[PDB]
Amino acid sequence: RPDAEKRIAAVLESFDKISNPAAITPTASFAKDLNLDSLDTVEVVVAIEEEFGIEIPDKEADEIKSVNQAVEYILAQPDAK
Amino acid sequence: MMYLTYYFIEITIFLAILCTIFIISAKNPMVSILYMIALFVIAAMYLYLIGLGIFSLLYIMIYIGAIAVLFLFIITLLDINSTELSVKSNIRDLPLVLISLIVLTISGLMIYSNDSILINKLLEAFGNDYNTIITQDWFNIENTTLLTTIGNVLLTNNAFILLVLAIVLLLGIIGPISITMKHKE
Amino acid sequence: PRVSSSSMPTDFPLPSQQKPNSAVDYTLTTLDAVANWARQGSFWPVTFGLACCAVEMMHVSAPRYDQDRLGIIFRASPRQSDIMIVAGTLTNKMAPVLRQVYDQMPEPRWVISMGSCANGGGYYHFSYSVVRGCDRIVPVDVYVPGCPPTSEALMYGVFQLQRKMRNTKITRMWYRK
Amino acid sequence: AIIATAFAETVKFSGSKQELQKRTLALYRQFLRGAPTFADLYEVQFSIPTIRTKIRQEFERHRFVDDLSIQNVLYAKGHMEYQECINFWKQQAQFLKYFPEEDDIQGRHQPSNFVDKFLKNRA
Amino acid sequence: MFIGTIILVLSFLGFVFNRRNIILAFICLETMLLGINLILLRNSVLFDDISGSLFAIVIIILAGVESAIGLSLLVSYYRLRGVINSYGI
Amino acid sequence: MNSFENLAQDVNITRSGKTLIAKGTGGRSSRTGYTATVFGANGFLGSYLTAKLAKHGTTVVVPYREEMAKRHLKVTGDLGVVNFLEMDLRNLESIDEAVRHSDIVVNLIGREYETKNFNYYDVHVEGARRIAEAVKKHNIARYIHVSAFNAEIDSPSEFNHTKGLGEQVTKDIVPWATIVRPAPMFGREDKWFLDRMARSPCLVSANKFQETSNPVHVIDVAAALERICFDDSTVAQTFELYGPQKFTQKQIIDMVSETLRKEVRHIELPKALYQAYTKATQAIWWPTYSPDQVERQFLSQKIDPSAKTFNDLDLTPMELPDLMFKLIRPYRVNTFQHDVSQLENKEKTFVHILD
């Protein structure tokens, strides 16, 4: 669990569009925090899958809409858990 | 003039040492196969030096002509990864490499002699000091050479081994087919 | 004693009008003549560039006009070739491929533009899908006129190119330089 | 039968904005995942982030288009370009058509006020 | 007697201490057989005998068939796996 | 539409009393009115210069000696724009012909080595004097000399000595002359910098790799010459086009080696031996390092602070560590892929051997 959120919250603040430099938490919505529009929600899952060296499907890369869903999907051990 | 061709055998020994070290150290294996070809050539040279050019040529037309063609024919088609020679990975073998070298060499040299004291068995191997006289007689009447003799004994005295090598070659045909060719139909 | 003067001659004739009068000059002229003899008697174009209007170029490979009699051989590959023949239309979808083939050729290299559609775009000059001249991409040494230029025009153009290379200075220019 | 090439999608005109939203998002995702391939295949002289920036710009271009049929047309054209790029059909020139900015500054005077345009007869 | 023993020993050591690939293993086997044949042919000359050269020609045959079978086996491994990695057999 | 990015106006007037009306939007067909003359367009810098001039329709007169090196310039413009003349500094009429109808003149002449027909003096001093006297006779409005960095009238290097004498003679005959002083230029197919560090089997330094300098991209110097040819404020002036970042030779070589992913070979053998080996290599017909250049290996770049710079032309000169990737990626070998592990299980699904 700490193996993931550590790099996750890394790539979230590496994403410059977040108006908050320091408002990344679990239970931080990608959308209603307004940190991200719908395109950036895809740019981020993109940067995450390539950070961890994986490629997420389409249906589930739609379902990933917050930090909890991301950490819980990397938990499945595709690679680089 | 005379002694310009005295140390050719020692030269081939030194060169075989070099080609072995190069086969072991090369990065891309293709180069290692090229050095193996250099080694088969040096062996063919040495065999000419000691009076067996027929085997020199049989080597060049068997080993180099087929086996090494095939080795390149394989490494050209397969994705044989590697790990370049290093110091983190292979240095650990140096004590064992050295012990194994010394023991295996001294034993491979002591083994060929029948003396009872050990050290003398090696000092006999290091006794390559004296020249061998060659006399000329007149009893050989024909033009028999080594290949003719090999044919005579192989096809008369040792026929059974020939008629078994035929079956070894049948394996060389039939096993690779069975392994590669899937008789799904 | 650092140099601080110059006996630099004026009125030194230009290469076009520079006659030989010294043994070094006759020697360099002979070496240049032999190199150019080689360049002339073996004139190998590359198979690329022959898109449109390849029929008239193939007729120069035919019996009545044999190009091989002059040592011409068409080659599949640039790397063995010296000459490029931009026949036919040079479209915008093709120009980068042309420049690749031209940069791949080893120097010395020439270019000869066969036809109107390759010299100035010809008939399709005002089209959306055309380069209005192969000059825009590559440097051209000879322009054959026609559409399609007659086999005789191509041979004459090659005889103008052989003349260009024959009045070329390889070593004499170095003896100037 | 004449079969489709690699990344071909059958042209299908969605009747709703809610489905085309999803299809456009998948296209954007594919562009982003494939951008490093767009940097390797085409000998590129800049960053993968700059490619992703240009992609975001090209998708922001038509962000405010509410006519459904025009959106379907735009999506089909974009999938065409993805197929053109990821399969190595385009060459370098046709790709760097999308990156004028990266090339060196074209000269000095780039008029932005009236008087300069008048002195250059561009007003 | 020297050169053969040396190629044999060095090739056994390079067979044993190869942490890199497998083609070195094939090569070291072939070189070991070479060194054997040189030992034997040297002895066959010094004795002026033929049994040594007979066993030598037989070794050449058997070694070539060995390499054929080995390089079909490798092809089977590769059929299934697709890559012959540095530390796989 | 296209633009005249080089010109600020369409009606320009030279200092010789010619009116030059621009025509077009600034593409291949346009004309700037101007007529220039570039004495070394066959070379490394002049090629980029004629490209930038003739992209906008400026007529370009290009004196040449070898007919075959030049042909790569005719591409750079429409018909009638690029015009060629055969010329030699030992013929005066040729130089008057080249400069007669010109509003602008550009002298890029100068070898980094000596020859049998031209020593450093004859090509950097007398050639400049000949061109200057013709620029003066015909009263050409503009003259834009280029004289190497670190130039100083008396110096250990004969090259910099001549380059300094070429400066003072040009400026003592043509008072309105503009002088540029570029620092070591780099780019694609450079002479003695990146193609060498990327191709040469082994480097050598009679010093250590310690000679300090400010290098610069050649395209930017060409942009500078473009922004000086048309700006008449730059008469009787002097420029130092050096670049933001100071780089020692060893620093450049380490960046070159990092980007190439190959270990560049450097030796660092002493001065007299290298100086002798260079001297003996000057008898073969192809260019090589010459005894006077290992002398410049001990002469770091002294920048003149009294002269204008890039920022006097609204330019933002580029940085070496960014551009080295673009310039050295072709020699990048790119041996293979990293870390093939975690791919056996994926490869196992595909058919590798058909029957």
Ligand SMILES: NC(=O)C1=CN([C@@H]2O[C@H](COP(=O)(O)OP(=O)(O)OC[C@H]3O[C@@H](n4cnc5c(N)ncnc54)[C@H](OP(=O)(O)O)[C@@H]3O)[C@@H](O)[C@H]2O)C=CC1
């Ligand atoms: N490149 C650099 O790093 C630096 C360059 N400079 C200066 O800037 C200029 C750039 O030249 P560069 O870019 O180096 O490429 P070159 O130095 O190769 O340009 C040389 C040009 O000068 C011409 N030329 C040389 N000698 C003669 C001669 N004797 N008679 C007639 N023409 C001659 C050549 O013509 P051809 O090619 O037909 O022989 C060529 O066109 C030079 O003046 C150089 O001193 C200064 C500092 C650094």
